[PDB]
Design brief:
heterodimer; A: 526 residues; alpha+beta; 3-stranded antiparallel beta sheet; B: 411 residues; 4 domains; 9 helices; 10 strands; binds the ligand Cn1c(Cn2ccc(C(F)(F)F)c(Oc3cc(Cl)cc(C#N)c3)c2=O)n[nH]c1=O; DNA-binding; transferase; Reverse transcriptase mutant; RT-aptamer complex; NNRTI resistance
DNA sequence: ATACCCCCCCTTCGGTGCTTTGCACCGAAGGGGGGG
């Protein structure tokens, strides 16, 4: 009852909605008349130009233009809670309020902006549905009701999502019942009609996809859809379901499933043997359900990372050995050319930022990589990168550096020169080594950089174990110097394989189309 | 009591709407006990859902501070209110401050909290505290008084600041004074025992009239590092090719740098590792090249109209550089920030302290912070930079993904 | 039933900026899970 309202306005420029209403419909009259008694929806005179659309179901009142015209509201919520971040609590209770919306008044000035004309005109004394800031308004009011109790005693832990009021304590059962009854009365004092205490839930619960037990937690059981023929839409649904399941079940691979999606809702496509085999494997993994555990601040987080191949990693955050708190996978590939170390540092950054978001602290990593390897990589890479803290763990596959491009010239190795060109307004490659070895060749759909990479590939092709190269373009230097492993361009993959086969390679750069050193001949033929 | 100066934005564009990044549990735990105290003393007040504006917040630990502090990222507010300070009031930049023997920096922002702020503008400076595992929404607070770290606050407070410091300027005309954000720079040509004496005297003077403030750097002792070419007796084809390429790169910076005899010297497809004779003509060319490189770039000039852009290149072994300029290929300043002390402990911390040094030097010399082009990935920088931050100012940075493989400021 | 918002996950566009003409890159959208 004593709930002070919140000012409401709109974006400047023009008043509220102006679309004609509709009295007649599928009766629907006595429903709203009842709220006139206690004033939830009151009667207003015929002087309201702010006409609103009308809707009733079995009242999701339409505001398709009002939401477009309402002033911007800041996001009250910033995500969804996760079970792993909940501390061990003995007693727990749920008190989901009744509809959460018909006990909170609406601002006095704003009532004129909305109307409900069913011959006559009714004003809303209460928050409607399909409203821009209704979750925010209720959430702020709901905190304004809660905070005296939390200030009175902070032992009781209270979570709150949308319209729900999760209470937890480490007290006995009867004391918890007394405290929750006191909370019920305190909430009622501000005019909330919560469901009866007999209707409160007792564990195991069912939350937003998660079933919670006195000492464990997991997701609600799911099944994998099966059909002889798959359209794209069902493939996307399966990918989403697998990604959702990947939060607690260790070792879930959804990538080479997802490559099938690269060929595209209702459209139907054939399948692949890899897809069927790995779907069967995933079904075998999901056959037996596993359990998580709950946070314990008297200990520390120790995450581990493993590599599954072709740019995919899995992590398993826990506190007690072989008792997972959470599990996940990282597979996204941004950019074009990365090795495994760059993706590993992206993975550790994502794991630590997620751990900060969830548990508010970072885990002491366990990485499958040698100390000296990371030391060399961070002392040699021109960018600045960091890893929080990590201990070596022996688990194959072991991420490491594949090939080392030499920083010094070497004797006993032939010095190749490379060059190519194309048409600015369909290119060619041609170069002269220190002895006249030329392998000029055209190619289609190429440009300067493509033919430079082609010339590098040719030089690697017609060289020995040790060879030095001089290039007229920095693009190839930028590509190869990063020690890349996988690439969109197959030529780059071939070049990487060639450098892996060889032992020692050294490079250099010269200005292009300048006739300096060996640039005269290599820029003459092509 | 004390009146307030109304603050108005530039019509046509919106206010700050930056999402607040997550924070460590200890940062939240300290910010709660700091913002509750700030609200008790009427400095800040809560607000409801109707406020569509939000700015971040994070609790740093000041240099050799047993307590914590607080910073609110007011970058967007300054981005929208630059014209307020560019028109309303502008303190002249002392040309002699660059040439002073030594200066001291004091945190004088406390008095910024004793001046009420405008009513209309008071809405815009709203900041959200995060929550652990997002169990409860952000407790969105509002600055009732002038905020620490906001660019326009010194513009309002400089009248009373001048009124306070006029006696000190009168009795001590030698001292030079420069205020930037919440920090004050006092410049003297005194010795350590006298510079410290005058700084403690100024602190006591501020104490005598109800202003409390809780290191030493030398503007004159900063020297630009000119690029030089390597010199030795036995040169190879690879080394001379590298020298010719570097002469090319540097011809962009220096108009008079030329390479034609060395380019004509290399005509055959020779091995890199062989030893090649170097003619006396190339000796004279190299001598002239080094003479050009030693001299500072001719025609270097500064324009306050444009913004300052600072690139940083990591040369390894605990060494970084920093190049500050406005117009491409004509650097206004270059430097070399080296330390092996923190190399074994951290790598991003080096970049943070380098950025702090660059912005402090730019504020001492030219008076405006540089726009940084950091050599780091966006998310790894945004995750950890606050853990190694101690300066109440926040510079603007943008990560150039392009690889600057040249690195000819230092081979 | 057909409209309404939050984190996560992917794939596929557009635009940026030369690294200037392909290319590497990143942000915004379009579906998926969870639902509210
Ligand atoms: C089952 N259970 C537990 C686990 N547990 C521990 C603390 C709390 C807290 F007090 F924080 F709300 C719980 O309340 C919640 C929180 C959330 Cl996100 C969803 C749901 C649902 N549906 C219930 C809680 O479920 N501990 N002991 C026991 O029996």
């Amino acid at each position: 009852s004593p709930i002070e309202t919140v000012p409401v306005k709109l974006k400047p420029g023009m008043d509220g909605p102006k679309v004609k209403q509709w009295p007649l419909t599928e009766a629907l009259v006595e429903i709203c008349t009842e709220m006139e008694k206690e004033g939830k929806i009151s009667k207003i005179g015929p002087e309201n130009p702010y006409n609103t659309p009308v809707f009733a179901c079995k009242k999701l009142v339409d505001f398709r233009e009002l939401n477009k015209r309402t002033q911007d509201f800041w996001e009250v919520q910033l995500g969804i809670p996760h079970p792993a971040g909940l501390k061990k609590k003995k007693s727990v209770t749920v008190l989901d309020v009744g509809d959460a919306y018909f006990s909170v008044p609406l601002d006095e000035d704003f009532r004129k902006y909305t109307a409900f004309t069913i011959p006559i005109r009714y004003q809303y004394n209460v928050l409607p549905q399909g409203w821009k800031g209704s979750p925010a308004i209720f959430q702020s009011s709901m905190t304004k009701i809660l905070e005296p109790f939390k200030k009175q005693n902070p032992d009781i832990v209270i979570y709150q999502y949308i319209d729900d009021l999760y209470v937890g304590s480490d007290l006995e059962i009867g004391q918890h019942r007394t405290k929750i009854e006191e909370l019920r009365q305190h909430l009622l004092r501000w005019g909330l009609t919560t469901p009866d205490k007999k209707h409160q839930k007792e564990p195991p619960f069912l939350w937003m996809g998660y079933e919670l037990h006195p000492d464990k937690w997991t997701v609600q059981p799911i099944v994998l859809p099966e059909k002889d023929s798959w359209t794209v839409n069902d493939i996307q649904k399966l990918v989403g379901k697998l990604n959702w399941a990947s939060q607690i079940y260790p070792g879930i691979k959804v990538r080479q499933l997802s490559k099938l999606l690269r060929g595209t809702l209702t459209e139907v496509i054939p399948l692949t043997e890899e897809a069927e085999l790995e779907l069967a494997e995933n079904r075998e993994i999901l056959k037996e359900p596993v359990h998580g555990v709950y946070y314990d601040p008297s200990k520390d987080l120790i995450a581990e990372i493993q590599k599954q191949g072709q740019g995919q990693w899995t992590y398993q955050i826990y506190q007690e050995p072989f008792k997972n708190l959470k599990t996940g996978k990282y597979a996204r590939m941004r950019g074009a050319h990365t090795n495994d170390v760059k993706q590993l540092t992206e993975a550790v950054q994502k794991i630590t930022t997620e751990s900060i978001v969830i548990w508010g602290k970072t885990p002491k990593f366990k990485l499958p990589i040698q100390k000296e390897t990371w030391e060399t990589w961070w002392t040699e890479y021109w960018q600045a990168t960091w890893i929080p803290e990590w201990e070596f763990v022996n688990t194959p596959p072991l991420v490491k550096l594949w090939y080392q491009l030499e920083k010094e010239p070497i004797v006993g190795a032939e010095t190749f020169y490379v060059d190519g060109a194309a048409n600015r307004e369909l290119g060619k490659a041609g170069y002269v080594t220190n002895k006249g070895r030329q392998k000029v060749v055209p190619l289609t759909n190429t440009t300067n950089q493509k033919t430079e990479l082609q010339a590098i590939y040719l030089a690697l092709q017609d060289s020995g174990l040790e060879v030095n190269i001089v290039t007229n373009s920095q693009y190839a230097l930028g590509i190869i110097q990063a020690q890349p492993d996988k690439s969109e361009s197959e030529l780059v993959n071939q070049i990487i394989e060639q450098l892996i086969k060889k032992e020692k390679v050294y490079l250099a750069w010269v200005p292009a189309h300048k006739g300096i050193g060996g640039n005269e001949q290599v820029d003459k033929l092509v | 009591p004390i009146e307030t100066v109304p603050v108005k934005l530039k019509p046509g564009m919106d206010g700050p709407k930056v999402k607040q990044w997550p924070l460590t549990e200890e940062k939240i735990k300290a910010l709660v006990e700091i913002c509750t105290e700030m609200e008790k003393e009427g400095k800040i007040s809560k607000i409801g859902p109707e406020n569509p504006y939000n700015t971040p917040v994070f609790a740093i630990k000041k240099k050799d501070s047993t307590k914590w502090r607080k910073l609110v990222d007011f970058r967007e507010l300054n981005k929208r209110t630059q014209d307020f300070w560019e028109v309303q009031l502008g303190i002249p930049h002392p040309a002699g401050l660059k040439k002073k023997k030594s200066v001291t920096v004091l945190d004088v922002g406390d008095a910024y909290f004793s001046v009420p702020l405008d009513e209309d503008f008071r809405k815009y400076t709203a900041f959200t505290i995060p929550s652990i595992n997002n169990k409860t929404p952000g407790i969105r607070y509002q600055y009732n008084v002038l905020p620490q770290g906001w660019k326009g606050s010194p513009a309002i407070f400089q009248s009373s600041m001048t009124k306070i410091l006029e006696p000190f300027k009168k009795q001590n005309p030698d001292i030079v004074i420069y205020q930037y954000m919440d920090d004050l720079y006092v410049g003297s040509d005194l010795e350590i025992g006298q510079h410290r004496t005058k700084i403690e005297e100024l602190r006591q003077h501020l104490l005598r009239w109800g202003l409390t403030t809780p290191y030493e750097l030398h503007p004159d002792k900063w020297t630009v590092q000119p690029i030089v070419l390597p010199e030795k007796d036995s040169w190879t084809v690879n080394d001379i090719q590298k020298l010719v390429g570097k002469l090319n790169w540097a011809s962009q910076i220096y108009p008079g740098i030329k390479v034609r005899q060395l380019s004509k010297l290399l005509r055959g497809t020779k091995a890199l590792t062989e030893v090649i004779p170097l003619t006396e003509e190339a000796e004279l060319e190299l001598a002239e090249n080094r003479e050009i490189l030693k001299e500072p770039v001719h025609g270097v000039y500064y324009d306050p109209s444009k913004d300052l852009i600072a690139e940083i290149q990591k040369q390894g072994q605990g060494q970084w550089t920093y190049q500050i300029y406005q117009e491409p290929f004509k650097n206004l300043k270059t430097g070399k920030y080296a330390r092996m002390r923190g190399a074994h402990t951290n790598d991003v911390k080096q970049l943070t302290e380098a950025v702090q040094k660059i912005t402090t030097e730019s504020i001492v010399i030219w008076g405006k912070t540089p726009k940084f082009k950091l050599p780091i990935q966006k998310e790894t920088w945004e995750t950890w930079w606050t853990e190694y931050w101690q300066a109440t100012w926040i510079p603007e940075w943008e990560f150039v993904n392009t690889p600057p493989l040249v690195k000819l400021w230092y081979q």
